[PDB]
């Protein structure tokens, strides 16, 4: 969908998927097919392998909320930050944890080589509906350092008015 093939950025070192569990609020995201809504959250829970179970939830414009259940598993237990996201009726897409503090923020990247083009996902997630605008900028610097159009990014709405039932 986007011209050019995938870059290979650096990922989180000594990534602990146990400290990555819990709820993560979406702060910024690259536009895509699937996330056509707001009030988006990801909840990661125990899974037998190297990874976690996935519950992604968002509220749509019409008010009804839509969730997906999935799995994120590391295929190389020695590289815990490079995981694969498996979901019902689809081929797995990558799930790379580029950077995280486990307690406040996380930067996740994903890219699929599509012939001469590529498809990509990117997400700034926080442990609260907001994240300090200074950390957003620092993470946008990392993203732009490897080709990510930080200017195509969409700020997810996490305002109580619209997300008044979560
Ligand atoms: C690297 C980033 C990234 C990947 C690999 C990704 C994968 C991904 N997210 C999806 C849905 C979704 N994904 C999210 C949200 C997230 N999903 C996340 O991985 C993160 C970090 C959030 C934000 C907290 C939500 C809310 C849906 C449901 C979309 C719907 O209602 O159909 C779907 C398919 C939905 C369906 O089957 O209908 C895929 C393949 N999304 C991403 O943003």
Author numbering: 22 to 187
Q: What did the article's authors report about this structure?
A:
Sandercyanin (SFP) is a BV-binding lipocalin protein found in the skin mucus of the Canadian walleye, Stizostedion vitreum (formerly Sander vitreus). BV associates non-covalently to each SFP monomer in a ZZZssa conformation and is stabilized by aromatic stacking, hydrophobic interactions, and water-mediated H-bonding inside the lipocalin-like beta-barrel fold of SFP. The binding of BV induces tetramerization of SFP via interaction between amino acid residues from adjacent monomeric subunits. Using a combination of designed site-directed mutations, X-ray crystallography, UV/VIS, and resonance Raman spectroscopy, we have identified multiple conformations of BV that are stabilized in the binding pocket of SFP.
Two mutations – L135E (from interface 1) and V71E (from interface 2) stayed monomers on binding to BV as identified by size-exclusion chromatography profiles. The absorbance spectra of BV-bound V71E and L135E show maxima at 380 nm and an attenuated red-shifted broad peak at the far-red wavelengths (∼680–700 nm) compared to the wild-type protein, where the red-absorbance is at 630 nm. The V71E and L135E mutations showed an order of magnitude reduction, with fluorescence quantum yields of 0.003 and 0.0025, respectively (for excitation at 630 nm). The overall fold of the monomeric variant proteins is very similar to the wild-type protein, with BV bound at the center of the barrel. In the BV-binding pocket, both monomeric variants revealed a rotated D-ring pyrrole of BV around the C14–C15 single bond. Measured torsion angles were 122° and 125° (counter-clockwise) for V71E and L135E, respectively. The conformation of BV is ZZZsss in the variants compared to ZZZssa in wild-type SFP. However, the atoms of the D-ring of the L135E have larger B-factors suggesting that even in the crystal structure, this ring is more flexible. However, in the monomeric forms, the orientation of the D-ring of BV is stabilized by interactions with the A-ring of BV (the D-ring moves closer to the A-ring of BV) and stacking interactions with the Y142 side chain (which rotates to stack with the D-ring). The lower resolution structure of L135E does not allow modeling of structured waters replacing the rotated residues; however, empty space possibly suggests randomly-oriented or the presence of low occupancy water molecules.
